[PDB]
């Protein structure tokens, strides 16, 4: 269930994003709802450190950018 997908402390943001949207397809609610969820859930459930940077990428940043920001070093 979607509440359970959270980003690992070394899992890169990309692979976490696949898990998330995989799971999200499985659950059955309105497309509308599943979008709301994303909005709450996906950034919030990233590894604590990674959000730090995400926070600084600005609101405008794309996924593409976030995934880049949040792969390792």
């Amino acid at each position, epitope marked *: 269930s979607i509440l359970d997908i959270k980003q690992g402390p070394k899992e890169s943001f990309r692979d976490y994003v696949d898990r998330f949207f995989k799971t999200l397809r499985a659950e059955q609610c309105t497309q509308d709802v599943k979008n709301w969820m994303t909005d709450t859930l996906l950034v919030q459930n990233a590894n*604590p*450190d*990674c959000k*730090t*940077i995400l*926070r*600084a*990428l*600005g*609101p*405008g*940043a794309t996924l593409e*950018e976030m995934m*880049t*920001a*949040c792969q*390792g*070093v």
Partner: antibody
């Protein structure tokens, strides 16, 4: 009383290497996002690189990507900038900078260092 | 990317006058903009952010205003300590870019 103090500026030859650092006193270091910002001889300011409060995540302006490396020793209350492959064009005052703590996204750079100068020339 | 254009490049006023620097983005920023002050040979100080809100310990003569794509900064009745440089930057998209900067000098 928040402080940022950069150092390590100097003269370096084109395609050389130099490492700037910044000692933060004043606040819980590992609680903030940090940046390096430069100012041209002309005085155009250009944001260069940013880093997670944790440290494991970084991000770079195209203009330095793959040439520069940002890092922090949280225990040493220090932020670093590793420069390699120096263009003459990298000649600037380099400023260490703190992202403000309070907005959902970062809404300002809070504080700045005083800067160290780097001149790259032959 | 989003780009910032400022103007004027420079302007010079007299103590007591009022003055408006502007600032213009290649995209919309929904108010995610900040303004820094730079006095000669010092480093920049944050002065305004989110277009409108003043940083702490910034006298009230400073107002920020704007929305969408054009924003601006205004100083009511100048004091000597206000003369310097002024830069805007945005915080919407990922490269936080800076205005060229508006150089403010004193008339006499």
């Amino acid at each position: 009383d928040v402080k940022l103090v950069e150092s390590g500026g100097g003269l370096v030859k084109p395609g050389g290497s130099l490492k700037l650092s910044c000692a933060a006193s004043g606040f819980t270091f590992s609680s903030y996002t940090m940046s390096w910002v430069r100012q041209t001889p002309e005085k155009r300011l250009e944001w260069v690189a940013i880093i997670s409060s944790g440290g494991s995540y970084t991000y770079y302006s195209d203009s330095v990507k793959g040439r520069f490396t940002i890092s922090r020793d949280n225990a040493k209350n220090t932020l670093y900038l590793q420069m390699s492959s120096l263009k003459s064009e990298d000649t600037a005052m380099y400023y260490c900078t703190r992202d403000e703590g309070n907005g959902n996204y970062v809404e300002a750079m809070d504080y700045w260092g005083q800067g160290t100068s780097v001149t790259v020339s032959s | 990317d989003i780009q910032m254009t400022q103007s004027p490049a420079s302007l010079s006023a007299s103590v007591g006058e009022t003055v408006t620097i502007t600032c213009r983005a290649s995209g919309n920023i929904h108010n995610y903009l900040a303004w820094y002050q730079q006095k000669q040979g010092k480093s920049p100080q944050l002065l305004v952010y989110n277009a409108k809100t003043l940083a702490d310990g910034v006298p009230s003569r400073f107002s920020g205003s704007g929305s969408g794509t054009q924003y601006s900064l205004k100083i009511n009745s100048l004091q000597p300590e206000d003369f310097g440089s002024y830069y805007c930057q945005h915080f919407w998209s990922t490269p936080r870019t800076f205005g060229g900067g508006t150089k403010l000098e004193i008339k006499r």
